Structures are given as structure tokens and as C-alpha cells.
């Protein structure tokens, strides 16, 4: 499994292996994204989830002191201004200077070397959102020899927005596509031009694309819960339903508001009026 | 198939507003009040039965899955749990503090 989270308009995905940042930023590259950028502290905590996932699959295969190329190099030219936060650094996918900073040890003043960053964790120890991985500077190394303890990188993916995932009123397995090669089921945020291929059944299979029902408005265009089997009704997973399950015959249902609230055209998200 | 969503030919809501739920109707369109207690429920044109219910039965009608009587915070008997929340949610409508279900049985 691919490992990806998708928050606000924006992707992570961490892929394992030895490749220099160079080799990393074009891979990147060739999906339309770039290398991570730690810009906000909670850029930060969504690049760790993508990283812990990324371990867990295989902890025990990766060295306990892990880098992982992100998108932060300082091309030969000048020598770091240690009074900027980023340390006179500049992210690869452009951008401005961010006040947040995670630096350990201590960089090198070295004005003749350009010298790329990557994220340090300790694999001893337990992940946890606090004790948020360190930056390390280097070499940015070269095609077969990517660095010491490089064991992967993280690419960012931006979009204009992002849909919500497909809600499952029945037994069903959805398959979110993502514009980047990498599909997932399991993807709290669906970005924008991505494909979701429902398997209802434990068997119909319903095709859906996310796309622009209006501005800062992304849809699906499916209306209600899918998979709906009347074996189950409101007794499996409350119909895939936002808060209550309407009953009515065997298996027949429609999602409900609490008084107050309003039922949108998804039938399935509700919706206070105020 | 069925009529295009025609939101001004929709029947107005209740004044006060369905005090139980809401949702659209058989085709999908329109703004619906959650069936109460012994409302039709079933198979076009038809509604859904309120939360805590069952459409025992085409078409049928809402009994309530507490079908025991039930002791409130208002300190009298209710016929079941359901009628509990039924005018519970009326007290909020009208400002009156919420019916909360204290036991079940009578009412000591």
C-alpha cells in the first residue's frame, strides 16, 4: 500500500528507496508535484503521518536513523544567514521563507557546496506528533550514492480542491485514484480529477470522477448512499449516513436531520441552518 | 424517473418546522418530515419513519423499537421512549427544558 494523506488542498505520499534528492525532485516531478516543504508546523505533523505509515510497513527493514529527501536545498552560491529561520535555505518548489524550523546539530557554513535537507527520524524510540522529526543538511548526493541513512523521500502534490470520500451505506470497497499514480482506499481527502471505482458487494461496480460542481465546490455527482443492501439498512454502519438513518420498509432508508439541520443533495450530509 | 427538483414547488415545511427529522421525498426532491408514530412508510410519494422506529408492514406504519412504557424527567409515564422524545424535541421548539428519559417503567 502506497502510503498517502491528503489534507486541505494538498497530497503527501513517502516512498522508500536510495535516491538522491535530485532523483527524488524528478520523480516528483514526473506526477506533477515536488519534494515536501515543512513550511508550517503542521505541514510537519501531516509529512510525519506519511513517513510513520511508510515505517510501519517495514520499520525493521530501515535503519533507526532514517533520512528522507523533502523539498529544502541551498544551491552553491552564498553562505547560510543564520538569522533566517529557513537558515538562508529556499524550498525547491519555489515559494517564500517560512518562520518554521526544526534544525539539529549544526549546519555547516559552507558558501561553496550546495547542500540539500532531509528529514531525520529516530526509529528506536516511538513516533509521536510531538517530538516532530529533525532537519539534517548534506550532500545532496548522486545517482546510486544518495547519502548516508537516505532511505526515501516525500513528495507534496498540490490541487485547486479536493472532494469528500465516497460515503457507503452497504458492503463495499471504493478505490480512490488520485491524478498522481498512486490510488489508495483509504483517503481522508480526495483531490480534484481523481477517480473513485466502487466495488459494492462482498458485485456492481459504480465509477465516479471527482469534479467542479461550482467554484470552491467539488462533487462526486452521486446522489444518496452507495452499496445499500436491504439485508443491513440503518444497522450497517448507520447507512453511511452524517448523523441519523431514516427507517422505512425491510431495508429502505434515506439519511435524516435533527431539527435544525438540512439535508443536502448528497442525501447523506446534513446541514445546520443556524 | 421522476420530476426535476422544483424548490419553490415544494410543499412549505410545517411553521413550526418538523420537530422529529427531515429529509427529501421518494424521488429525492423536496424538503420531508420524518414519519412519528403509525405514519405510512413504504412504496412514490411516500415517507420515512422517524429515528427509533420500524416500518412494520407496499406501505406500512411507524411502531417504535421501545415499544415499553418509559419514565421521564418531567415526572410522568410515557407510553414508550419514542413519545419521550416526541415531545422532548417539542420543548425545545417552545423553549421548555429538554424531556430527559430518567428510567423505564412507571414513574415513582
Excluded at 547519502?147 to 471504493?174: D, H, T, W, Y
Amino acid at each position: 500500500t502506497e502510503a498517502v494523506v491528503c489534507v486541505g488542498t494538498a497530497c503527501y505520499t513517502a516512498h522508500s528507496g536510495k535516491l538522491s534528492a535530485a532523483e527524488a525532485q524528478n520523480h516528483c516531478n514526473q506526477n506533477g508535484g515536488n519534494l515536501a516543504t515543512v513550511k508550517s508546523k503542521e505541514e510537519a505533523q501531516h509529512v510525519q503521518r506519511v513517513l510513520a505509515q511508510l515505517l510501519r510497513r517495514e520499520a525493521a527493514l530501515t535503519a533507526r536513523m532514517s533520512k528522507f529527501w523533502i523539498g529544502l536545498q541551498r544551491e552553491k552560491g552564498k553562505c547560510l544567514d543564520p538569522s533566517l529561520p529557513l537558515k538562508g535555505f529556499s524550498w525547491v518548489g519555489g515559494g517564500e521563507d517560512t518562520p518554521y524550523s526544526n534544525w539539529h546539530k549544526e549546519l555547516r557554513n559552507s558558501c561553496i557546496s550546495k547542500r540539500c535537507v532531509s528529514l531525520l527520524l529516530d526509529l528506536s524510540q516511538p513516533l509521536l506528533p510531538s517530538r516532530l522529526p529533525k532537519w539534517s543538511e548534506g550532500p545532496c548526493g548522486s545517482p546510486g550514492s544518495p547519502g548516508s541513512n537516505i532511505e526515501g523521500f516525500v513528495c507534496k502534490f498540490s490541487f485547486k480542491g479536493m472532494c469528500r470520500p465516497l460515503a457507503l451505506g452497504g458492503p463495499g470497497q471504493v478505490t480512490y485514484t488520485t491524478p498522481f499514480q498512486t490510488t489508495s482506499s483509504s483517503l481522508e481527502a480526495v483531490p480534484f480529477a481523481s477517480a473513485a471505482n466502487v466495488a459494492c458487494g462482498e458485485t456492481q461496480s459504480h465509477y465516479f470522477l471527482c469534479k467542479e460542481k461550482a467554484p470552491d465546490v467539488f462533487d462526486w455527482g452521486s446522489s444518496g448512499p452507495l452499496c445499500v443492501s436491504p439485508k443491513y439498512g440503518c444497522n450497517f454502519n448507520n447507512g453511511g449516513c452524517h448523523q441519523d438513518c431514516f427507517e422505512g420498509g425491510d431495508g429502505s432508508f434515506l439519511c435524516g436531520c435533527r431539527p435544525g439541520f438540512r439535508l443536502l443533495d448528497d442525501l447523506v450530509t446534513c446541514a445546520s441552518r443556524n
